[model samples]
Target chain A: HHHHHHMSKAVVQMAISSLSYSELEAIEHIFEELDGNEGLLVASKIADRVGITRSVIVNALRKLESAGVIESRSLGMKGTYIKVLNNKFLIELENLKS
Target chain B: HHHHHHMSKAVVQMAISSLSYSELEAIEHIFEELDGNEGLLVASKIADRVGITRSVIVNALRKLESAGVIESRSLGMKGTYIKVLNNKFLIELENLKS
Candidate 1:
């Protein structure tokens, strides 16, 4: 027996309505770089990658924070937001990759 | 023919650092209720369930929020903290759930 599905039903059902295209891309982009270890990217860096302003980054960051997607800390600069890659999520995606 | 690696060498590495047993249990217990959806609870509620003080719940809330594990929104008299179940993590755990 095989438990393969084109898209894991759970991900397909993610509350995308709560996230914009840019926001989702921002999240994926952050984690894509973080194959291992926690990920941290400052707003300026995110702005540079997302081609948005600090304000936009701030807005997105707030939403992401409220959505429980990323957490923030001060690292010698204004702030650095880190993505807590769920060990569980990585395992699940690894299975999908199989 | 087995990708069945114990702990993925990641969780094992999470080790016993920065987090106390109570902390890990708090995180797990919150997410377990959120198997397939977001979960919400008030500080008082968590205190009651976790059998800790409201101050402890507050502290845990801060830590979990800092860890990007859960988020909160003002509901009314108090605030409601919710767990955002990582779909990817669930998939990984499901394999282990076997």
Candidate 2:
């Protein structure tokens, strides 16, 4: 059996309504660039791609991690590994017509 | 039967992590003062009680409302009625000892 739990549209809407435009953009960038089979990257890499500073991206990532939207861990010499935890919000965002 | 649905504790935590300290405090004030059987109040009332400006409170309320943490609507000349939509975040917060 598959365990696929989903939040209601309304609840998800509220959950997403909490993020700033920048935060939302940061998450969206990850969802688009990294959510497939590729699942990890460095903070500066994301910053470069998003055209945002590493510090700001790091701050946004920390908030995203706290919110359970993403998971990040440092691998010492290998750098940091990042993963997007939930994609329902991304799906909802993608399906938005406007 | 009662329909009681809750976002996962982790997700709730993450959603809340998106807010600022002042936003969190403004929300806490409402959960304390207006949640449960008492369900609505004006923005200025909340600002007066919370020691935040009316504009700041309104901005926070809009963000909270967008995040699905709170709900608000205008009741014609009576002013806006505000309600806390979900409190699992608050529960998780309270359960945190430090």
Best by lDDT: 2
Let me know the DockQ for model 2: 0.04
List residue ranges in candidate 1 displaced over 4 A: A1-16, A35-37, A76-85, A88-98, B1-98
User: What's each prediction's TM-score?
Assistant: 0.36, 0.42
Model 2 lDDT tens row, B62-83: 5555444545787857556776
Fraction of the reference Cα-Cα interface contacts (below 8 Å) that each candidate reproduces: 0.12, 0.04
- What is the docking quality class of candidate 2? incorrect
Best by DockQ: 1
Residue B69, candidate 2: C-alpha displacement in angstroms: 3.2
**After aligning candidate 2 to the native by TM-score, how far in Å is the CA of A31 from where it should be?**
20
User: What is candidate 1's CA lDDT for residue B19?
Assistant: 45
Q: What digit string (tens of lDDT, one per residue) describes model 2 on residues A6-86?
A: 332444565466656776676666556565633666666668887887666665666555444446887767556776445
TM of chain B, each: 0.51, 0.64
Across residues A1-98, which tens digit of lDDT does each residue of candidate 1 receive? 32222122222223223456666555555555563646556667767887866675555455544333344555765556465433233444344431
